[PDB]
Design a protein around this ligand. Structure first.
Ligand SMILES: CC(C)C[C@@H](C=O)NC(=O)[C@H](CC(C)C)NC(=O)[C@H](CC(C)C)NC(=O)OCc1ccccc1
Ligand SMILES: CC(C)C[C@@H](C=O)NC(=O)[C@H](CC(C)C)NC(=O)[C@H](CC(C)C)NC(=O)OCc1ccccc1
Lengths: 123, 240, 238, 195, 73, 201, 213, 237, 215
C-alpha cells in the first residue's frame, strides 16, 4: 500500500499518513497534566527564551472557557486554529444550551474537528 | 504509446488514439446493413444468438428513435441503448418546442454532437457504438445517415457497420437501390446478411429486419413476420 | 497493462478491462438459478454461511408483488441496486397506479449501470441479478451484467459453478413451459444441485426458493417453507 | 389594437392600424404593428408594446437559428409554435395577442391566431385587438371562400377601417402586407375605405 | 480439446466457456489447464473430469488461488 | 386549557385538565397534556394540540440522545433552552404552544415556562392556558413553600377544578403528577364531576 | 383567485370493541350543492388489521391514502414486518404535521386490532393529533354521530345501568342507526353505508342503503 | 494486491476489491469481543486491554449502549466506530420518533450498514467517507422476535449469529465457540463460557479490570455494564 | 393558470355496454364572445382511451401535447405494454394535484373514457385534483343541466346499449344548448369500443322554438 494519501489503507491495516501526523506531536515541547481533588493542574516546558523575542505571544497553555483550559503539543499554528474553534464552540454551547460546556463535550468537539481533517484528502 | 491513454490528449503526429480504440470495438461487433430504397429505408442486423437460453428478441440491436426515425446499432449494446435514449429525448424536445416531427438530418446532427462531446473530455470515454438512422417523410423522402463513434455523420445510399462492413458494402453496391421497390429490397438485405454471416465462426444468428417507407406510412415498424420469413427463404436458396 | 487503470480508458486491443473485471466479481458469488413456466417464474439460490454458527446470507430480495430479484456479486451493490428497484416500482404504483412492467424496470436498471461504465469516479456496479416477475404479458426472467446488458432468458444461472446448472437448463429448457409449479421448482433446485460440489447437498438451511406467479405475489420461501419443495426430490445422481 | 389576417390560396393578406396608446394619449400615430418574423412569415402584434416587441424579437432570433441550422425555409406552424410556447409559459407575465400569418412551401399561405393564453388555432380569417370586437360581424359576413388577393386586400382594408372608426384605441393609417411565393408587398393606406 | 483427447473428459465440459475464461493465455498454458485438471480429478479420485475441475485448473495455472472472501456472498 | 405547576419543599407538583376543543365543539375529554420526557422530566402542554405534541416529542428524542451521548440526563434549563430555540426559529409562522418543563436535576427542583412567542422564564409557581388566570388565583391564595405533600395535591386538584368551572375550554379529569428527586409519580386522575360533589359538599 | 381546498363532504365512524374494530363511512362525494358521485366509500384498508377513513377535500384524501400505502410498503421492506395499527397512527401524525404550513384538509380515523388483538381507534385532527379512543366519529356529520356512541357504547349520563361489554352484533346495529339518522339531518350524508369489521380472521365489508336525497 | 489497491474505485483483474479487504484487516488490530445469543438473552464480553494505570478505564468504550434493548461491541478504529455508533443511536431514536416503537436489532444493523456501504457512492455527502470504515460491530439486543445477535463488517455485510467473535483472537475464539455453544445454553452459562474463552485467548490474566462484560435480557433493560460482578463471576469460575 | 382566458363549456360522458361516449361543443369563449367556433375539445389518447376537457383550452392544448408525447414514447418502446384508461386517470390526478399544491393550477375539468379488457371506464379530474370513476359524468353547467337526465335513465336501466346512450347524449347536448350561454350548436361525439376511438365531426341538434308563440 502507500504512506502518501490520507485515505489509502495498508495491507497490515494502517493509515500511515495519520500516524506520520503523531510524529509532529512528539517533536513539540513537553506538557504534563494531573487531576487534583480541587486543583487540576497542567504544566508546560521549553520556554526557550530567544533573547530579543517577547514571550507574551508564545502561548502553549491557552484557556478555552472559564471552567476549561488546554495545553497543546505539536505545530504551533495548527494548535492556534483548533483552540479558536474550541473557544467558539464553548460560547455556542452556552447559546444552544444555557449551561457551561462540560470538559468531555469540548474534548469530543476537538476530537471531531480533528477526525474531520483525517477523513478526506485535500486536508 | 503512452499518449494513447487520454481522450483529451492529441498524439504528437496529431490524432487521438482513444477515439480510434472506440472504433475497433465497433469493428468487432456483428454487421448491420441498411439500404436506402426509393420508397423508404430497410435495415437488417445479423444479431447473434448466444447460449440459446436467452429468449428470442433478447438483446435486440434495432430500436425506434421516433415513430418515423429508426436506428440500427453495432458495438456495445449498452452504449447504444444510451444513445437511443439521447436521440429519443432530442426528438421529444423537437416535437415539443418546434411543433413538428424531427427532420432526420437535424436528429442525426444532434445525436452526433452528443457522441462528439464525449471525445473531448478526459473524464468520459468516447462512445464505443456506431449507429445508423433511417426515416421516410413525404416532404424529405427516404433519408439514411450513419454516425461513427467519433461523432461523424454523412448520408449513405447504403451502409454496413460491423465486422463485415467492407464485404457487405461490396454486395450492397451491386443492388439497384436508387429505383428498387422496398418490398424487393428487404429480400436483398436478407441475402446480403446471409452472404456476410460467416455462420461457422459466429454459430447461431437471428435476422432482425426493420422497415420505414411509403408502405409503412412513415412508421419504423419491424418488418411483419412472414415478410421476413420469405426473405429468409430467398436468402437460404440463394446461399445454396 | 497500463490500459487497465480506469473504466474511462480504452485498451489498445479495443476492450475495457475494468468492466470485464467487474463481471468477474459476479462469478465469486454463489450460483442462482431462474426458470419460467407459462404461468409461474421461480428463482432458486444457494445461501453460503460465513461462519457455521452464523445464519446463511440472504440471496433473494423482494422488489414488489410483481417483481423479485436474486443476488450474485457484491452484497454492497445489490443493496444499492435493490433500493433503486423498490423506489422505481413504488413510484409506478403511485404515478400510474399500475404494477410496473418488469421489462421497463430492467431497462431502467440497465440505464443506471452504463453511467459508471462510461464515466470515471464510480466502480462499475459489481452485482448480477436474476429478476423474476409476472406482468401483463406473462412471466419474465431477466439477467443483468456489470456491463449494463440485460437479457430476457427462458432460464438462466449466474455465479460460481453456474455452467453445470446452465447445461441442465439447456437440456431441460423445452419441458419448462408446460410443467406445473412443483415441477418447475423441482427442476430449478435440480439445476442448482449440479452447481454444488459433489460432497455438498441441498438442505433447508442452504436453499432459498422464490416464486412469483399469475395467482401468487412474489413470495420468498426459506427454512421450513423450502421443505415441501425439497421433499420428494430425485436422489442425487451418482 | 386592430390586426386581421385572411388566407388566399397562394398566400396571406395581413393588415393592422397605426396607434400605440397610453391612456387616451397616442404615443405613436404611425406604428408598424406588422413585423417580419422571417422572410415569408410576418406577425401582427396587439396588446402591450413592450411585451410584443420582446417576444417577436426573441422568436425572430430562434427561427433564424433554426433555418440556418436546418438549411430550409421555416414552416409557419413552427413560427406559431415558438410564439405559442413563450406566451403559454409566461402567460401571467406577458399581455400580448399575436396573429402569425405566413407563406410556407410545404403547406402554403396560412394564418395562426395565438390568443393571450398561448392557445394556437389555424384560422381562415383571424381578427385581433380592441377593435376586433366591433368588426366581428363584418368579418363573418363579408368573408367568402376563395377570395382573390385583391379582394382579400380590399376586405382587410375595409374591415380594419370600420373598426378604427369605432375604436378610439385604433386609428391613423392601415398597414397592409400580402405574403406569397414571390415575397411580401407592403402598402400603407392613408385611412382609405371610408364608408 | 486437442490435449485432453487422451484424457476421459466428461461430455458435459464446455470448452468455449473455458476458452472465454482463459483470456491472454499462451497455448502451453491452455495445455497446462488440461494437464492440471487431470491431476485435480485424480486428487478427488474422479473417474472423469467435470467442467468445474477444468475451471480449477485455470486458477491453478494463473496461480490466482480461490476462496470465499465475504463482501461478495 | 388549564395547566398548573408549583415547586414546594417536597418536590414539584404538575396538574392539568383533560379537554381538547375544536372551536366550540369539544374534541375530547381524555387528552393527556403532560408528556413524560424522561423518568425525572415532565413537560406540560397548552395551546395548539398538534404543535405541542410534536415539539415536546422532538425534545424528548433530543434528550434521549443527550443522555446516551453525554452519559448524564439533560438539565431542566438545557431542556427549556432547547425547546425555546427550536420554537424561536418558527416565529410569526403561527405556531401556538405554551409549556412548562419541570424536573429534578443536579441543581435542584427546576420548573421552566417555554412559550411559542419565545418567552423562557423560571418560577416557583406557573399556570398556562385559557384557565390559567383562574388557576393562578386559587393557587396563589394557599400556595406555601412549606405545604404538606397531601395538602399541596389538594391545592392543585382544587385550582384545576375551580378553573374548569369558569373556563368553557377547560374541563375533564385532573391529572396529578409529582416530580421529586426519585422521579415523577402519577398521583391520581380524578373526574371534575366526582370532585364537584366532594369539593362543593 | 384559486382556492386550494373544497369541502367534498362525507362522514366516518370507528367503534373499537374488545376483539373487533368497525370503521364505517357514508359513500357520497359532494361538491357545493351538487352530488359528484353516490358511490365514493371513505374506508380504505391499509393493512389486514388496519382501516383508515379520510373525509374532507377529496384530492387531499386521495393523496394521503397513496402516501400511507407507499410508506407501509417502504416499512415492510425495511423492517420485514407490517406496520402495527399504533405505528400507522404515529406515522400519520408526522406526515400530517409535515404539511403544517399547507394543511391537508383530511379528518382521519384509524381503526384496527392492536398488537394484543384488542380493537383500537386513533382519531386525528387535520395537522395530526391522535388519541386512542373506544369510539370516534368525524366528518360533516361528526357532531350528530358522536353523542349517541357516548350514551350507549360509553353509558355516559346513565345511572343504575349495567356496563355490559359491546358485542359485534350490537355494534353493527349502532353504526347503521347513527348513520341512518345522520342522513336524515345531514345534506352531505346519505346513499350507502360501507362498514368494515376488523376481526382476527380479517376485514369484512357490508353495505347498507341510506336516503338518496 | 500488486496495485489496484489505490482506491475502492479500481477493480482487481481477479475481480476482488482491495481497500475493502484492507479495512477488514484493520479489525484484527482490535481487542477480541465475544457475543453469545441465548433464549434468556444476549451476552457481550470484551478485552479492555488498558494501556496505562494512569488512564481512566471509562474513557475506553468497547461496549456502548445503542438503546435500552440494544448494546454494541466494537473492534477496530476508535474514531470510525464513534461515527457508526452515533448513527445507530440517532436512528433508534428517530425510528421511535416516527413509529412510536423500539427498532429491531436487525433493522439497526441494516441502517448502520447503509452508511458503511457508502465507501464511495459519489452522490451522498460528497467529501465524506471516501474510504471504507475499519470497525466490526456486534449488535446484541432483545427485540419483538426475541434475543438476537448481529455482526456487521466494514463492507456493510451483516448476519445473525448465535455466537460470534470479533477483533484479534477472533479466529481462535470462534473455534472455541463452536465447541462450547449449544441451543439450550442459559445466559448465565453463556456468560461463564464467554469469559473462559476470553481468558484462554488473552495474554494477560483475566482480572476484573482486564475484562468488561455486558448482558441484555428480555426482563431487564440494557444492564450491559456488570460492575463489581465482574469480580464475582470471575472468582467463581 | 391563475386566470382562465379562452374556455370550453360542459363535456358529457355516459358509459354504454361495450364502450363509453363523450360529447363536447366545438366552441372557445373569451368571456361572453365565442371567439373560436371550430375547436375540438375531445382528444384520442391511445386506442383504448379518449379525453374531453372543459376550461382553459391553452391548458388542455398543453396537456394534449404532454399526454400525446407520453403515448408516442410508450409506442417507441413497443414492449407489448400500453397505458390503461385508469392509468391515464391516475396520471392526470397526480398532475392536477401537484399543480394545485404549487398554487399554479391547470384550469381544466377533464373526462377520460375508455374500454379496456371488456370494461368501460369513465373518470372526472377537477383542477383541484378531485377524481372519481362514475357511470355518468358532466362538467361545467352540464352537471346541473345534464347529469340529472343521465342519472334517472342510468338508475332505471343500469346498462344502456350504444344507440340508446348516443341518443341520451344528443338529447342532453340540446338541453345544454338551450340553457347554457357558453354552449354552441356544433358538438362532436367520440366513442371508445374494442374497434377503437372514433371522433364524429361537427353535429347539430334539432331545436324546438315553438314555446315562443305561446307568450
Ligand atoms: C403592441 C402595440 C402596438 C399595441 C398597443 C396599442 O396601442 N398597445 C399599447 O400601447 C398598450 C395599451 C394596451 C394595454 C391596451 N400600452 C403600452 O404599451 C404603453 C406604452 C406606450 C409608450 C406605447 N404602456 C405600458 O407599456 O406601460 C403600462 C403597461 C405595462 C404592461 C402591459 C400593459 C401596460
Ligand atoms: C392537547 C392540548 C395541548 C390541547 C388543549 C390546549 O389548550 N386544548 C384545545 O382545545 C386546543 C387548543 C385550541 C383552542 C386552539 N384545541 C385544538 O387544538 C383543536 C382540536 C384538537 C383535538 C387537535 N384543533 C383546532 O382547533 O385546529 C387546529 C388546526 C390548526 C391548523 C390546521 C388545522 C387544524
Amino acid at each position: 500500500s502507500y504512506d502518501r494519501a490520507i485515505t489509502v489503507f495498508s495491507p497490515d491495516g494502517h493509515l500511515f499518513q495519520v500516524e506520520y501526523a503523531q510524529e509532529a506531536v512528539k517533536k513539540g515541547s513537553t506538557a504534563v497534566g494531573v487531576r487534583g481533588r480541587d486543583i487540576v493542574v497542567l504544566g508546560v516546558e521549553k520556554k526557550s527564551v530567544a533573547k530579543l523575542q517577547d514571550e507574551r505571544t508564545v502561548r502553549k497553555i491557552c484557556a478555552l472557557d472559564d471552567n476549561v483550559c488546554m495545553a497543546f503539543a505539536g505545530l504551533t499554528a495548527d494548535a492556534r486554529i483548533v483552540i479558536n474553534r474550541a473557544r467558539v464552540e464553548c460560547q455556542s454551547h452556552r447559546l444552544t444550551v444555557e449551561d457551561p460546556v462540560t470538559v468531555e463535550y469540548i474534548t469530543r468537539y476537538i476530537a471531531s474537528l480533528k477526525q474531520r481533517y483525517t477523513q478526506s484528502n485535500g486536508r | 504509446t503512452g499518449y494513447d491513454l487520454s481522450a483529451s490528449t492529441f498524439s504528437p503526429d496529431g490524432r487521438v488514439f482513444q477515439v480510434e480504440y472506440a472504433m475497433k470495438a465497433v469493428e468487432n461487433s456483428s454487421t448491420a446493413i441498411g439500404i436506402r430504397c426509393k420508397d423508404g429505408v430497410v435495415f437488417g442486423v445479423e444479431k447473434l444468438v448466444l447460449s440459446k437460453l436467452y429468449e428470442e428478441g433478447s438483446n435486440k440491436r434495432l430500436f425506434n428513435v421516433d415513430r418515423h426515425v429508426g436506428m440500427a446499432v453495432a458495438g456495445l449494446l449498452a452504449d447504444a441503448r444510451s444513445l437511443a435514449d439521447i436521440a429519443r429525448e432530442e426528438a421529444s424536445n423537437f416535437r415539443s418546442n418546434f411543433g413538428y416531427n424531427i427532420p432526420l438530418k437535424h436528429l442525426a446532427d444532434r445525436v452526433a454532437m452528443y457522441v462528439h462531446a464525449y471525445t473531448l473530455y478526459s473524464a468520459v470515454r468516447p462512445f464505443g457504438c456506431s449507429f445508423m438512422l433511417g426515416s421516410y417523410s413525404v416532404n424529405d423522402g427516404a433519408q439514411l445517415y450513419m454516425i461513427d463513434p467519433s461523432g461523424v455523420s454523412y448520408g449513405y445510399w447504403g451502409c454496413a457497420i460491423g465486422k463485415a462492413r467492407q464485404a457487405a458494402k461490396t454486395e450492397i453496391e451491386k443492388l439497384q437501390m436508387k429505383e428498387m421497390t422496398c418490398r424487393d429490397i428487404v429480400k436483398e438485405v436478407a441475402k446480403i446478411i446471409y452472404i456476410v454471416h460467416d455462420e461457422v465462426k459466429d454459430k447461431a444468428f437471428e435476422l432482425e429486419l426493420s422497415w420505414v417507407g411509403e408502405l409503412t406510412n412513415g412508421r419504423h415498424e419491424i418488418v411483419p413476420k412472414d415478410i421476413r420469413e420469405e426473405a429468409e427463404k430467398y436468402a437460404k436458396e440463394s446461399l445454396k | 497493462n497500463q490500459y487497465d487503470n480506469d473504466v474511462t480508458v480504452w485498451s489498445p486491443q479495443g476492450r475495457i478491462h475494468q468492466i470485464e473485471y467487474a463481471m468477474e466479481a459476479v462469478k465469486q458469488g454463489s450460483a442462482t438459478v431462474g426458470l419460467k413456466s407459462k404461468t409461474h417464474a421461480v428463482l432458486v439460490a444457494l445461501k453460503r454461511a460465513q461462519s457455521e454458527l452464523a445464519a446463511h446470507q440472504k440471496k433473494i430480495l423482494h422488489v414488489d408483488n410483481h417483481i423479485g430479484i436474486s443476488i450474485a456479486g457484491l452484497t454492497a451493490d445489490a443493496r444499492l441496486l435493490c433500493n433503486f428497484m423498490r423506489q422505481e416500482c413504488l413510484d409506478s404504483r403511485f404515478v400510474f397506479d399500475r404494477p410496473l412492467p418488469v421489462s421497463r424496470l430492467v431497462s431502467l436498471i440497465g440505464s443506471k449501470t452504463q453511467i459508471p461504465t462510461q464515466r470515471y469516479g464510480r466502480r462499475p456496479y459489481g452485482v448480477g441479478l436474476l429478476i423474476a416477475g409476472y406482468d401483463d404479458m406473462g412471466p419474465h426472467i431477466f439477467q443483468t451484467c456489470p456491463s449494463a446488458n440485460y437479457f430476457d432468458c427462458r432460464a438462466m444461472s449466474i455465479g460460481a459453478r453456474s455452467q453445470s446448472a446452465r447445461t441442465y437448463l439447456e437440456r431441460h429448457m423445452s419441458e419448462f413451459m408446460e410443467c406445473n409449479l412443483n415441477e418447475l421448482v423441482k427442476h430449478g433446485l435440480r439445476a442448482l444441485r449440479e452447481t454444488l460440489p459433489a460432497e455438498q447437498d441441498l438442505t433447508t438451511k442452504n436453499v432459498s426458493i422464490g416464486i412469483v406467479g399469475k395467482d401468487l405475489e412474489f413470495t420468498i420461501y426459506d427454512d421450513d417453507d423450502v421443505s415441501p419443495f425439497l421433499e420428494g426430490l430425485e436422489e442425487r445422481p451418482q | 389594437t386592430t390586426i386581421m389576417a385572411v388566407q388566399f390560396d397562394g398566400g396571406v393578406v395581413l393588415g393592422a392600424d397605426s396607434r400605440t396608446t397610453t391612456g387616451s394619449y397616442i404615443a405613436n400615430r404611425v406604428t408598424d404593428k406588422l413585423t417580419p418574423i422571417h422572410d415569408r412569415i410576418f406577425c401582427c402584434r396587439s396588446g402591450s408594446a413592450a411585451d410584443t416587441q420582446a417576444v417577436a424579437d426573441a422568436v425572430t432570433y430562434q427561427l433564424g437559428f433554426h433555418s440556418i441550422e436546418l438549411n430550409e425555409p421555416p414552416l409557419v406552424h413552427t413560427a406559431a409554435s415558438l410564439f405559442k410556447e413563450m406566451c403559454y409559459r409566461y402567460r401571467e407575465d406577458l399581455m400580448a395577442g399575436i396573429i402569425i400569418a405566413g407563406w410556407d412551401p410545404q403547406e402554403g399561405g396560412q394564418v395562426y391566431s395565438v390568443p393571450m393564453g398561448g392557445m394556437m388555432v389555424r384560422q381562415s380569417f383571424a381578427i385581433g385587438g380592441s377593435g376586433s370586437s366591433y368588426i366581428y360581424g363584418y368579418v363573418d359576413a363579408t368573408y367568402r371562400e376563395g377570395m382573390t388577393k385583391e379582394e382579400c386586400l380590399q376586405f382587410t382594408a375595409n374591415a380594419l377601417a370600420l373598426a378604427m372608426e369605432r375604436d378610439g384605441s385604433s386609428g391613423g393609417v392601415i398597414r397592409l402586407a400580402a405574403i406569397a411565393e414571390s415575397g411580401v408587398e407592403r402598402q400603407v393606406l392613408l385611412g382609405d375605405q371610408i364608408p | 480439446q486437442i490435449h485432453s483427447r487422451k484424457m476421459n473428459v466428461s461430455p458435459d465440459v464446455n470448452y468455449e466457456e473455458l476458452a472465454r475464461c482463459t483470456d491472454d493465455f499462451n497455448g502451453a498454458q491452455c495445455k497446462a489447464v488440461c494437464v492440471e485438471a487431470g491431476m485435480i480429478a485424480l486428487r478427488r479420485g474422479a473417474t472423469e473430469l467435470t467442467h468445474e475441475d477444468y475451471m480449477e485448473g485455470i486458477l491453478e495455472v494463473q496461480a490466482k488461488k480461490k476462496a470465499n472472501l465475504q463482501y461478495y456472498a | 386549557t388549564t395547566t398548573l405547576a408549583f415547586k414546594f419543599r417536597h418536590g414539584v407538583i404538575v396538574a392539568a385538565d383533560s379537554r381538547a376543543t375544536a372551536g366550540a365543539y369539544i374534541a375530547s375529554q381524555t387528552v393527556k397534556k403532560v408528556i413524560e420526557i424522561n423518568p425525572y422530566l415532565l413537560g406540560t402542554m397548552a395551546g395548539g394540540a398538534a404543535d405541542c405534541s410534536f415539539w415536546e416529542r422532538l425534545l424528548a428524542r433530543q434528550c434521549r440522545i443527550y443522555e446516551l451521548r453525554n452519559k448524564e440526563r439533560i438539565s431542566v434549563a438545557a431542556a427549556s433552552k432547547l425547546l425555546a430555540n427550536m420554537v424561536y426559529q418558527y416565529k410569526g409562522m403561527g405556531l401556538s404552544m405554551g409549556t412548562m418543563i419541570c424536573g429534578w436535576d443536579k441543581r435542584g427542583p427546576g420548573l421552566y415556562y417555554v412559550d411559542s412567542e419565545g418567552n423562557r422564564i423560571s418560577g416557583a409557581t406557573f399556570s398556562v392556558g385559557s384557565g390559567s388566570v383562574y388557576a393562578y388565583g386559587v393557587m396563589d391564595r394557599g400556595y406555601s413553600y412549606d405545604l404538606e405533600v397531601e395538602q399541596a395535591y389538594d391545592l392543585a386538584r382544587r385550582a384545576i377544578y375551580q378553573a374548569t368551572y369558569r373556563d368553557a375550554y377547560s374541563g375533564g379529569a385532573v391529572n396529578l403528577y409529582h416530580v421529586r428527586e426519585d422521579g415523577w409519580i402519577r398521583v391520581s386522575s380524578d373526574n371534575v364531576a366526582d370532585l364537584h360533589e366532594k369539593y362543593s359538599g | 383567485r384559486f382556492s386550494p381546498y373544497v369541502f367534498n363532504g362525507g362522514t366516518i365512524l370507528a367503534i373499537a370493541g374488545e376483539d373487533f374494530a368497525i370503521v364505517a363511512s357514508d359513500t357520497r362525494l359532494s361538491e357545493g350543492f351538487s352530488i359528484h358521485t353516490r358511490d365514493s366509500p371513505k374506508c380504505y384498508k391499509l393493512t389486514d388489521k388496519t382501516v383508515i377513513g379520510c373525509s374532507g377535500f377529496h384530492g387531499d384524501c386521495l393523496t394521503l391514502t397513496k402516501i400511507i400505502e407507499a410508506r407501509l410498503k417502504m416499512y415492510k421492506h425495511s423492517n420485514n414486518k407490517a406496520m402495527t395499527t399504533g405505528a400507522i397512527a404515529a406515522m400519520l401524525s408526522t406526515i400530517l404535521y409535515s404539511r403544517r404550513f399547507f394543511p391537508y384538509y383530511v379528518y382521519n380515523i384509524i381503526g384496527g386490532l392492536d398488537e394484543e388483538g384488542k380493537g383500537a381507534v386513533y382519531s386525528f385532527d387535520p395537522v395530526g393529533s391522535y388519541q386512542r379512543d373506544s369510539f370516534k366519529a368525524g366528518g360533516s356529520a361528526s357532531a350528530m354521530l358522536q353523542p349517541l356512541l357516548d350514551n350507549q357504547v360509553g353509558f355516559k349520563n346513565m345511572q343504575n345501568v349495567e356496563h355490559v361489554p359491546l358485542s359485534l352484533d350490537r355494534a353493527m346495529r349502532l353504526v347503521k342507526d347513527v348513520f341512518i339518522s345522520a342522513a336524515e339531518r345531514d345534506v352531505y350524508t346519505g346513499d350507502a353505508l360501507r362498514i368494515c369489521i376488523v376481526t382476527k380472521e380479517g376485514i369484512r365489508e357490508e353495505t347498507v342503503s341510506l336516503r338518496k336525497d | 494486491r500488486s496495485e489496484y489497491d489505490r482506491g475502492v474505485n479500481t477493480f482487481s483483474p481477479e475481480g476482488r476489491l482491495f481497500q475493502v479487504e484492507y479495512a477488514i484487516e484493520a479489525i484484527k488490530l482490535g481487542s477480541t469481543a465475544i457475543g453469545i445469543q441465548t433464549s434468556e438473552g444476549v451476552c457481550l464480553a470484551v478485552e479492555k486491554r488498558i494501556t496505562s494505570p494512569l488512564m481512566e478505564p471509562s474513557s475506553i468504550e468497547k461496549i456502548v449502549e445503542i438503546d435500552a434493548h440494544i448494546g454494541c461491541a466494537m473492534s477496530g478504529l476508535i474514531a470510525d466506530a464513534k461515527t457508526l455508533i452515533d448513527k445507530a443511536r440517532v436512528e433508534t431514536q428517530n425510528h421511535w420518533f416516527t413509529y412510536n416503537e423500539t427498532m429491531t436489532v436487525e433493522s439497526v444493523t441494516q441502517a448502520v450498514s447503509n452508511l458503511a456501504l457508502q465507501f464511495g457512492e459519489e452522490d451522498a455527502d460528497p467529501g465524506a467517507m471516501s474510504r471504507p470504515f475499519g470497525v466490526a460491530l456486534l449488535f446484541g439486543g432483545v427485540d419483538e422476535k426475541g434475543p438476537q445477535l448481529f455482526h456487521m463488517d466494514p463492507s456493510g455485510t451483516f448476519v445473525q449469529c448465535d455466537a460470534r467473535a470479533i477483533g484479534s483472537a477472533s479466529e481462535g475464539a470462534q473455534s472455541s465457540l463452536q465447541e462450547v455453544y449449544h441451543k439450550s445454553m442459559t445466559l448465565k452459562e453463556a456468560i461463564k463460557s464467554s469469559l473462559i474463552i476470553l481468558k484462554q485467548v488473552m495474554e494477560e490474566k483475566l482480572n476484573a479490570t482486564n475484562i468488561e462484560l455486558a448482558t441484555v435480557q428480555p426482563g431487564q433493560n440494557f444492564h450491559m455494564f456488570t460492575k463489581e460482578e465482574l469480580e464475582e463471576v470471575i472468582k467463581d469460575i | 393558470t391563475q386566470n382562465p382566458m379562452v374556455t370550453g363549456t360542459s363535456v358529457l360522458g355516459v358509459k354504454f355496454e361495450g364502450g363509453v361516449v363523450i360529447a363536447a361543443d366545438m366552441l372557445g369563449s373569451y368571456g361572453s364572445l365565442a371567439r373560436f367556433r371550430n375547436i375540438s375539445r375531445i382528444m384520442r389518447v391511445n386506442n383504448s382511451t379518449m379525453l374531453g376537457a372543459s376550461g382553459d383550452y391553452a391548458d388542455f392544448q398543453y396537456l394534449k401535447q404532454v399526454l400525446g408525447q407520453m403515448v408516442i414514447d410508450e409506442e417507441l418502446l413497443g414492449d407489448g405494454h400500453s397505458y390503461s384508461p385508469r392509468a391515464i386517470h391516475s396520471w392526470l390526478t397526480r398532475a392536477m394535484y401537484s399543480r394545485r399544491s404549487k398554487m399554479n393550477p391547470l384550469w381544466n375539468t377533464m373526462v377520460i373514457g375508455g374500454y379496456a379488457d371488456g370494461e368501460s371506464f369513465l373518470g372526472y379530474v377537477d383542477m383541484l385534483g378531485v377524481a372519481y370513476e362514475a357511470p355518468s359524468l358532466a362538467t361545467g353547467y352540464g352537471a346541473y343541466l345534464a347529469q340529472p337526465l343521465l342519472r334517472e335513465v342510468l338508475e332505471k336501466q343500469p346498462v344502456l346499449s350504444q344507440t340508446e346512450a348516443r341518443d341520451l347524449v344528443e338529447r342532453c347536448m340540446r338541453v345544454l344548448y338551450y340553457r347554457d350561454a357558453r354552449s354552441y350548436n356544433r358538438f362532436q361525439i367520440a366513442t371508445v369500443t374494442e374497434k377503437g376511438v372514433e371522433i364524429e365531426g361537427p353535429l347539430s341538434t334539432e331545436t324546438n322554438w315553438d314555446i315562443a308563440h305561446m307568450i
